Amino acid sequence: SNNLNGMHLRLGIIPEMPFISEPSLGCTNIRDPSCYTGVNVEIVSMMSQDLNFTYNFITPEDLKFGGKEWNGLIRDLLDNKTDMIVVALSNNAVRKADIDFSLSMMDGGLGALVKSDGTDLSHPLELLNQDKYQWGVVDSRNPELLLASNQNADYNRIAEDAVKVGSYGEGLERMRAGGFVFIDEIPGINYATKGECDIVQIGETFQPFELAFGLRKNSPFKNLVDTFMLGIREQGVISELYAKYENQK
Amino acid sequence: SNNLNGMHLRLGIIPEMPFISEPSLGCTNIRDPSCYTGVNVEIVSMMSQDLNFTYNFITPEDLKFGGKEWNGLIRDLLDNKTDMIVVALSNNAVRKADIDFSLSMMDGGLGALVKSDGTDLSHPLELLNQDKYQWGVVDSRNPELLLASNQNADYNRIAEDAVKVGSYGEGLERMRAGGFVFIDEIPGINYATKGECDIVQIGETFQPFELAFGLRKNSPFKNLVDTFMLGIREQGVISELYAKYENQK
Ligand code: NA
Ligand code: NA
Ligand code: NA
Ligand code: NA
């Protein structure tokens, strides 16, 4: 019964399926949630009904998730342009120093994906000892941040020598063209490459992380968000949404 | 030197000169401060430069200042749609129960103004014992709220039996047409009627109040706003702005 009594929230988004779509082509206002679909758009709609808040979406000008002074979604949150980030925001230690994360919607991890040549690598760190494949990460997105901050200096070297692409879409494009290992996040990258039989994963998933919403420290509505998220997680609702969008593709 | 480090604020406005103009006719976005002039628009511009915040303006759909569940500017502030109200918001006890007021920009009071008939009244409470003049107040604006909440049951009766108009402009219009005493706020109503020789004030100004900005309780930026406001008040800058706009008319 306890709720936010009609508080208005601005929610930070970046389009990336299956979590958040691009705005409809007919959209007349990019902030209008009715212009969007996706797992997280539906989570937010249900959350708003339960927690009794109104909301609009705000997309950062720089279209970055957030790297560190921060940019992207995290800079908009810290600046009070938004009140909560509702992408699948990866919880890593560098971000957690400066913002809070909700109870998570699901667990992710890194995968190294490539267009299969037959002479595929067997483990991601084999990239450091060869010259057949380039590899890449998105600037100001969690995989780069993880790899560069990791205790393991070989992961540091992977980030150091990676091609830096400007967007997730660009990384996928370069990967699809061949000769290029894109290191990014599961499960999302498995959705993004669904049905592309020439795309394979090198070795095992590595460096797991939670995917959650982002909030300023000491937020008065964190506990209510966490309780709502836990309910739909424990009930299987988040898994069912994800599967619905996976099957729509 | 201490400041808000680039925080973004949404500021609540209602057009009413000399404090805030209507948006320019060429305006492409009603939230854009560059579309406005007025005493308080200039105060906010200087405040933003000193306190290092970015901002836009938000006008309530109902175009009400705030009466009590609240409506108008005060409901937008309580709902977190805005972060500070930057009209000349009158500080009264009913509002102060639920929001905070900044250090004030100036002192106001109520005046009862009328189109002179020669047979003008001598004191505002004489309205209660005659039938020549109607009188009126704006709904959900401070004079009604003051008069209705006052310890003096005769002021209560004035509010009770007053015509309720939907806007300040409408009250002025009815007053200008004759036979109608408009009870509203000085000094603003003296600006609004500058040069109208047929308009006179009945008796003395009464029921003074501070005019200030509105903030949620426990705002972390109240002390910085207060310090800035005090500086421009003590220096005479607010008086000089007011005089500049008074002379532009
Ligand atoms: Na980079
Ligand atoms: Na190494
Ligand atoms: Na009324
Ligand atoms: Na009376």
Side-chain angles (χ1 to χ4, degrees):
Chain A
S1 283
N2 292 349
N3 62 68
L4 301 180
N5 302 332
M7 188 180 188
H8 187 70
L9 304 177
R10 283 87 173 185
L11 303 179
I13 64 162
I14 291 174
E16 186 181 308
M17 287 297 279
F19 304 108
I20 306 175
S21 72
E22 298 288 346
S24 63
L25 302 178
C27 193
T28 60
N29 183 340
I30 192 174
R31 297 196 176 184
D32 187 351
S34 72
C35 294
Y36 297 82
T37 63
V39 171
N40 293 25
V41 174
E42 295 197 46
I43 290 173
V44 165
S45 177
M46 296 185 321
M47 187 186 284
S48 75
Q49 180 177 17
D50 193 282
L51 274 60
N52 196 11
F53 63 82
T54 60
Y55 66 102
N56 289 300
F57 291 159
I58 293 186
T59 304
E61 305 182 24
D62 69 10
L63 284 171
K64 295 174 182 174
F65 276 72
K68 189 171 66 161
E69 277 200 334
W70 291 95
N71 60 27
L73 294 160
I74 298 179
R75 179 56 166 276
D76 276 6
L77 178 68
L78 289 169
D79 289 342
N80 226 277
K81 185 158 190 60
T82 55
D83 304 299
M84 181 164 63
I85 297 168
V86 300
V87 301
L89 195 69
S90 308
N91 182 339
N92 64 48
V94 181
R95 294 172 173 181
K96 188 185 147 200
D98 293 336
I99 64 163
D100 277 352
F101 288 84
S102 73
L103 185 142
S104 62
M105 59 180 98
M106 67 188 58
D107 297 337
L110 299 183
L113 277 64
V114 68
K115 186 186 162 188
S116 187
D117 282 341
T119 67
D120 314 327
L121 301 172
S122 297
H123 313 284
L125 288 180
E126 290 177 354
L127 286 166
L128 298 174
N129 313 288
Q130 57 80 57
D131 45 46
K132 177 170 172 35
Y133 297 95
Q134 293 185 279
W135 63 96
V137 296
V138 187
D139 176 79
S140 295
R141 189 186 168 88
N142 170 69
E144 179 194 48
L145 281 194
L146 282 181
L147 293 166
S149 63
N150 197 257
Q151 63 177 304
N152 187 329
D154 293 325
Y155 284 145
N156 301 159
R157 181 98 191 255
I158 291 284
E160 174 188 335
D161 289 342
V163 175
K164 305 314 188 296
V165 296
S167 68
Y168 179 73
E170 186 178 351
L172 297 168
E173 183 177 89
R174 289 280 288 274
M175 178 191 73
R176 287 173 184 131
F180 181 97
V181 177
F182 186 38
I183 302 166
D184 205 274
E185 304 185 341
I186 61 145
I189 195 170
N190 292 150
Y191 168 94
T193 60
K194 187 184 166 234
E196 297 177 45
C197 296
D198 43 343
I199 299 304
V200 301
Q201 178 167 175
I202 297 163
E204 298 298 303
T205 295
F206 59 110
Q207 294 296 307
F209 44 90
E210 291 188 296
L211 293 161
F213 292 175
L215 293 79
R216 288 182 292 278
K217 294 183 167 202
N218 300 307
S219 177
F221 55 84
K222 186 171 186 294
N223 292 336
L224 290 173
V225 168
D226 286 354
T227 290
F228 179 82
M229 191 77 86
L230 179 59
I232 52 163
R233 189 177 73 189
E234 186 277 334
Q235 290 167 353
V237 164
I238 300 179
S239 290
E240 292 167 355
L241 286 168
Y242 194 96
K244 178 179 75 174
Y245 279 91
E246 216 175 3
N247 291 324
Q248 286 184 358
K249 177 168 170 166
Chain B
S1 283
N2 292 349
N3 62 68
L4 301 180
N5 302 332
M7 188 180 188
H8 187 70
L9 304 177
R10 283 87 173 185
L11 303 179
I13 64 162
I14 291 174
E16 186 181 308
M17 287 297 279
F19 304 108
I20 306 175
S21 72
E22 298 288 346
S24 63
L25 302 178
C27 193
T28 60
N29 183 340
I30 192 174
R31 297 196 176 184
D32 187 351
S34 72
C35 294
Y36 297 82
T37 63
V39 171
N40 293 25
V41 174
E42 295 197 46
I43 290 173
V44 165
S45 177
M46 296 185 321
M47 187 186 284
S48 75
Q49 180 177 17
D50 193 282
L51 274 60
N52 196 11
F53 63 82
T54 60
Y55 66 102
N56 289 300
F57 291 159
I58 293 186
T59 304
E61 305 182 24
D62 69 10
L63 284 171
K64 295 174 182 174
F65 276 72
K68 189 171 66 161
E69 277 200 334
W70 291 95
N71 60 27
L73 294 160
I74 298 179
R75 179 56 166 276
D76 276 6
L77 178 68
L78 289 169
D79 289 342
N80 226 277
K81 185 158 190 60
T82 55
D83 304 299
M84 181 164 63
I85 297 168
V86 300
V87 301
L89 195 69
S90 308
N91 182 339
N92 64 48
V94 181
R95 294 172 173 181
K96 188 185 147 200
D98 293 336
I99 64 163
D100 277 352
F101 288 84
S102 73
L103 185 142
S104 62
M105 59 180 98
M106 67 188 58
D107 297 337
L110 299 183
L113 277 64
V114 68
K115 186 186 162 188
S116 187
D117 282 341
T119 67
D120 314 327
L121 301 172
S122 297
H123 313 284
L125 288 180
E126 290 177 354
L127 286 166
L128 298 174
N129 313 288
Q130 57 80 57
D131 45 46
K132 177 170 172 35
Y133 297 95
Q134 293 185 279
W135 63 96
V137 296
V138 187
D139 176 79
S140 295
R141 189 186 168 88
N142 170 69
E144 179 194 48
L145 281 194
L146 282 181
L147 293 166
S149 63
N150 197 257
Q151 63 177 304
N152 187 329
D154 293 325
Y155 284 145
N156 301 159
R157 181 98 191 255
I158 291 284
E160 174 188 335
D161 289 342
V163 175
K164 305 314 188 296
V165 296
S167 68
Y168 179 73
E170 186 178 351
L172 297 168
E173 183 177 89
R174 289 280 288 274
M175 178 191 73
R176 287 173 184 131
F180 181 97
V181 177
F182 186 38
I183 302 166
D184 205 274
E185 304 185 341
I186 61 145
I189 195 170
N190 292 150
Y191 168 94
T193 60
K194 187 184 166 234
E196 297 177 45
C197 296
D198 43 343
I199 299 304
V200 301
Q201 178 167 175
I202 297 163
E204 298 298 303
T205 295
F206 59 110
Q207 294 296 307
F209 44 90
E210 291 188 296
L211 293 161
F213 292 175
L215 293 79
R216 288 182 292 278
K217 294 183 167 202
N218 300 307
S219 177
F221 55 84
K222 186 171 186 294
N223 292 336
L224 290 173
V225 168
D226 286 354
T227 290
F228 179 82
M229 191 77 86
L230 179 59
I232 52 163
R233 189 177 73 189
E234 186 277 334
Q235 290 167 353
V237 164
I238 300 179
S239 290
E240 292 167 355
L241 286 168
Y242 194 96
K244 178 179 75 174
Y245 279 91
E246 216 175 3
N247 291 324
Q248 286 184 358
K249 177 168 170 166

XYZ file of all heavy atoms in Angstrom, chain B residues 191-235:
362
model
N 2.091 48.326 -10.077
C 2.702 48.243 -11.386
C 1.614 47.991 -12.445
O 1.589 48.608 -13.510
C 3.760 47.124 -11.420
C 4.249 46.779 -12.804
C 5.403 47.368 -13.342
C 3.556 45.872 -13.579
C 5.827 47.051 -14.642
C 3.961 45.561 -14.860
C 5.083 46.149 -15.379
O 5.505 45.830 -16.663
N 0.723 47.056 -12.171
C -0.285 46.609 -13.149
C -1.220 47.747 -13.530
O -1.759 47.729 -14.656
C -1.089 45.428 -12.601
N -1.406 48.708 -12.629
C -2.310 49.839 -12.847
C -1.604 51.160 -12.999
O -2.228 52.218 -12.901
C -3.351 49.946 -11.691
O -2.705 50.139 -10.419
C -4.200 48.710 -11.680
N -0.304 51.118 -13.277
C 0.489 52.327 -13.462
C -0.112 53.172 -14.572
O -0.419 52.662 -15.641
C 1.941 51.965 -13.796
C 2.911 53.146 -13.845
C 4.320 52.697 -14.287
C 5.224 53.880 -14.670
N 5.837 53.740 -16.060
N -0.369 54.424 -14.246
C -0.895 55.381 -15.215
C -2.403 55.378 -15.411
O -2.928 56.191 -16.179
N -3.114 54.497 -14.713
C -4.567 54.430 -14.810
C -5.132 55.373 -13.751
O -5.366 54.989 -12.609
C -5.053 52.979 -14.630
C -4.543 52.050 -15.720
C -4.953 50.614 -15.528
O -6.134 50.361 -15.219
O -4.095 49.735 -15.741
N -5.340 56.634 -14.127
C -5.693 57.662 -13.146
C -7.056 57.429 -12.472
O -7.294 57.901 -11.375
C -5.658 59.041 -13.816
S -3.982 59.482 -14.394
N -7.932 56.671 -13.107
C -9.239 56.398 -12.513
C -9.217 55.297 -11.420
O -10.244 54.995 -10.825
C -10.239 56.005 -13.612
C -9.653 55.033 -14.646
O -8.402 54.898 -14.736
O -10.459 54.433 -15.406
N -8.058 54.679 -11.204
C -7.955 53.555 -10.258
C -7.414 54.118 -8.980
O -6.381 54.813 -8.984
C -7.065 52.444 -10.814
C -7.652 51.883 -12.115
C -6.877 51.306 -9.773
C -9.046 51.362 -12.042
N -8.109 53.853 -7.879
C -7.644 54.290 -6.565
C -7.633 53.147 -5.556
O -8.353 52.153 -5.695
C -8.516 55.414 -6.018
C -8.491 56.605 -6.987
C -9.915 54.933 -5.775
N -6.866 53.343 -4.495
C -6.814 52.382 -3.405
C -7.729 52.817 -2.267
O -7.738 53.980 -1.860
C -5.376 52.219 -2.900
C -5.305 51.262 -1.736
C -3.871 50.771 -1.353
O -3.696 50.043 -0.350
N -2.898 51.121 -2.121
N -8.535 51.895 -1.792
C -9.407 52.162 -0.647
C -8.669 51.988 0.677
O -8.280 50.867 1.042
C -10.592 51.237 -0.656
C -11.455 51.468 -1.895
C -11.430 51.428 0.616
C -12.408 50.347 -2.206
N -8.477 53.090 1.394
C -7.786 53.000 2.651
C -6.334 52.593 2.515
O -5.691 52.833 1.494
N -5.829 51.979 3.577
C -4.444 51.625 3.699
C -4.167 50.175 3.277
O -5.059 49.338 3.265
C -3.984 51.828 5.148
C -4.085 53.282 5.632
C -3.201 54.235 4.829
O -1.978 53.992 4.768
O -3.723 55.214 4.242
N -2.916 49.894 2.923
C -2.433 48.529 2.708
C -2.638 47.771 3.996
O -2.645 48.384 5.065
C -0.974 48.564 2.230
O -0.966 49.210 0.934
C -0.310 47.123 2.151
N -2.936 46.480 3.884
C -3.182 45.646 5.055
C -2.639 44.246 4.892
O -2.357 43.775 3.788
C -4.711 45.624 5.382
C -5.603 45.104 4.291
C -6.240 43.893 4.418
C -5.869 45.847 3.164
C -7.106 43.444 3.408
C -6.727 45.373 2.146
C -7.322 44.173 2.300
N -2.456 43.550 6.008
C -2.026 42.165 6.032
C -0.729 41.941 5.216
O -0.709 41.249 4.179
C -3.124 41.233 5.555
C -4.341 41.236 6.524
C -3.948 40.697 7.843
O -3.394 39.610 7.909
N -4.173 41.464 8.908
N 0.374 42.492 5.709
C 1.634 42.321 4.983
C 2.130 40.895 4.968
O 1.794 40.036 5.835
C 2.602 43.234 5.738
C 1.970 43.606 6.911
C 0.519 43.354 6.878
N 2.984 40.603 3.979
C 3.587 39.290 3.838
C 4.884 39.448 3.057
O 5.013 40.373 2.275
C 2.666 38.297 3.065
C 2.035 38.907 1.857
C 2.634 38.866 0.619
C 0.823 39.581 1.978
C 2.065 39.495 -0.441
C 0.258 40.222 0.888
C 0.879 40.155 -0.321
N 5.800 38.524 3.264
C 7.003 38.420 2.445
C 6.692 37.769 1.112
O 5.840 36.886 1.064
C 8.063 37.630 3.173
C 8.643 38.351 4.384
C 9.814 37.617 4.951
O 9.681 36.456 5.453
O 10.956 38.151 4.880
N 7.416 38.158 0.077
C 7.406 37.565 -1.254
C 8.741 36.886 -1.423
O 9.779 37.547 -1.269
C 7.201 38.635 -2.330
C 5.811 39.277 -2.271
C 5.827 40.608 -3.006
C 4.806 38.379 -2.907
N 8.754 35.601 -1.745
C 9.980 34.808 -1.731
C 9.919 33.706 -2.748
O 8.915 33.542 -3.448
C 10.183 34.261 -0.304
N 10.963 32.893 -2.840
C 10.922 31.655 -3.610
C 10.453 30.528 -2.715
O 10.615 30.559 -1.487
C 12.282 31.345 -4.218
C 12.745 32.305 -5.319
C 14.021 32.133 -5.837
C 11.939 33.284 -5.847
C 14.496 32.949 -6.877
C 12.426 34.111 -6.894
C 13.714 33.913 -7.390
N 9.870 29.493 -3.320
C 9.370 28.318 -2.628
C 10.252 27.100 -2.838
O 10.663 26.861 -3.981
N 10.497 26.326 -1.764
C 11.353 25.153 -1.828
C 10.728 24.058 -1.017
O 9.971 24.342 -0.082
C 12.758 25.392 -1.249
C 13.671 26.371 -2.019
C 13.337 27.799 -1.755
C 15.126 26.116 -1.617
N 11.004 22.805 -1.349
C 10.591 21.716 -0.462
C 11.314 21.846 0.868
O 12.430 22.339 0.953
C 10.868 20.334 -1.104
C 9.939 20.005 -2.246
C 10.225 18.610 -2.797
N 11.509 18.521 -3.469
C 11.695 18.902 -4.735
N 10.696 19.350 -5.451
N 12.914 18.833 -5.275
N 10.659 21.348 1.917
C 11.333 21.258 3.211
C 12.630 20.442 3.102
O 12.728 19.489 2.349
C 10.382 20.657 4.250
C 9.221 21.568 4.526
C 8.354 20.984 5.600
C 7.390 22.017 6.100
N 6.960 21.590 7.462
N 13.612 20.845 3.884
C 14.889 20.135 3.986
C 15.702 20.156 2.720
O 16.515 19.283 2.418
C 14.667 18.674 4.429
C 13.990 18.595 5.791
O 14.460 19.202 6.750
N 12.835 17.950 5.846
N 15.504 21.209 1.925
C 16.253 21.309 0.689
C 17.721 21.521 0.937
O 18.086 22.445 1.677
C 15.742 22.473 -0.167
O 16.553 22.583 -1.330
N 18.550 20.754 0.233
C 19.978 20.950 0.433
C 20.506 22.238 -0.151
O 21.654 22.582 0.193
C 20.584 19.713 -0.242
C 19.611 19.281 -1.240
C 18.243 19.616 -0.663
N 19.767 22.926 -1.015
C 20.301 24.133 -1.610
C 19.639 25.408 -1.051
O 19.958 26.503 -1.476
C 20.246 24.073 -3.162
C 18.888 23.792 -3.731
C 17.974 24.803 -3.924
C 18.541 22.524 -4.084
C 16.732 24.556 -4.444
C 17.303 22.269 -4.642
C 16.394 23.272 -4.798
N 18.786 25.280 -0.027
C 18.163 26.461 0.562
C 19.174 27.479 1.105
O 19.019 28.668 0.865
C 17.196 26.107 1.692
C 16.437 27.335 2.213
C 15.353 26.952 3.163
C 14.536 28.153 3.555
N 15.290 29.166 4.353
N 20.186 27.041 1.838
C 21.093 27.997 2.403
C 21.838 28.794 1.340
O 22.069 29.989 1.516
C 22.104 27.301 3.343
C 21.453 26.749 4.600
O 20.398 27.206 5.032
N 22.105 25.756 5.205
N 22.206 28.170 0.220
C 22.883 28.876 -0.855
C 21.963 29.873 -1.550
O 22.367 30.985 -1.911
C 23.486 27.893 -1.877
C 24.689 27.080 -1.367
C 25.031 26.046 -2.432
C 25.857 27.960 -1.119
N 20.704 29.501 -1.736
C 19.715 30.408 -2.313
C 19.536 31.618 -1.401
O 19.506 32.747 -1.838
C 18.388 29.674 -2.538
C 17.251 30.581 -2.848
C 18.514 28.681 -3.681
N 19.385 31.346 -0.112
C 19.181 32.430 0.882
C 20.346 33.416 0.899
O 20.126 34.622 0.917
C 18.975 31.849 2.264
C 17.618 31.217 2.483
O 16.731 31.281 1.623
O 17.443 30.596 3.579
N 21.574 32.909 0.854
C 22.762 33.770 0.877
C 22.786 34.626 -0.382
O 23.059 35.841 -0.329
C 23.991 32.915 1.004
O 23.992 32.367 2.342
C 25.250 33.762 0.803
N 22.511 34.016 -1.540
C 22.490 34.802 -2.753
C 21.414 35.875 -2.704
O 21.654 37.037 -3.082
C 22.259 33.904 -3.979
C 22.216 34.683 -5.239
C 23.388 35.049 -5.847
C 21.017 35.147 -5.732
C 23.387 35.862 -6.951
C 21.035 35.964 -6.888
C 22.210 36.278 -7.444
N 20.198 35.519 -2.267
C 19.130 36.466 -2.253
C 19.436 37.639 -1.324
O 19.122 38.801 -1.636
C 17.831 35.775 -1.842
C 16.602 36.608 -2.033
S 16.070 36.681 -3.754
C 15.058 35.210 -3.835
N 20.008 37.336 -0.186
C 20.344 38.382 0.754
C 21.340 39.349 0.167
O 21.263 40.568 0.380
C 20.883 37.799 2.046
C 21.293 38.826 3.104
C 20.177 39.776 3.552
C 21.847 38.069 4.277
N 22.296 38.852 -0.578
C 23.277 39.754 -1.149
C 22.663 40.750 -2.094
O 22.932 41.972 -2.021
N 21.828 40.294 -3.019
C 21.206 41.218 -3.960
C 20.131 42.071 -3.277
O 19.888 43.194 -3.700
C 20.636 40.521 -5.198
C 19.692 39.344 -4.920
C 21.804 40.061 -6.078
C 18.849 38.938 -6.109
N 19.508 41.610 -2.205
C 18.567 42.447 -1.490
C 19.283 43.566 -0.768
O 18.924 44.745 -0.912
C 17.749 41.582 -0.497
C 16.590 42.352 0.150
C 15.731 41.502 1.061
N 16.391 41.182 2.305
C 15.940 40.323 3.197
N 14.895 39.570 2.932
N 16.517 40.205 4.367
N 20.302 43.211 0.003
C 21.035 44.200 0.824
C 21.738 45.223 -0.063
O 21.833 46.380 0.315
C 22.052 43.509 1.723
C 22.766 44.429 2.735
C 23.953 45.178 2.173
O 24.589 44.722 1.210
O 24.271 46.247 2.760
N 22.237 44.809 -1.221
C 22.888 45.738 -2.154
C 21.970 46.664 -2.897
O 22.411 47.596 -3.548
C 23.688 44.947 -3.191
C 24.891 44.303 -2.590
C 25.521 43.255 -3.505
O 24.972 42.903 -4.562
N 26.675 42.744 -3.092
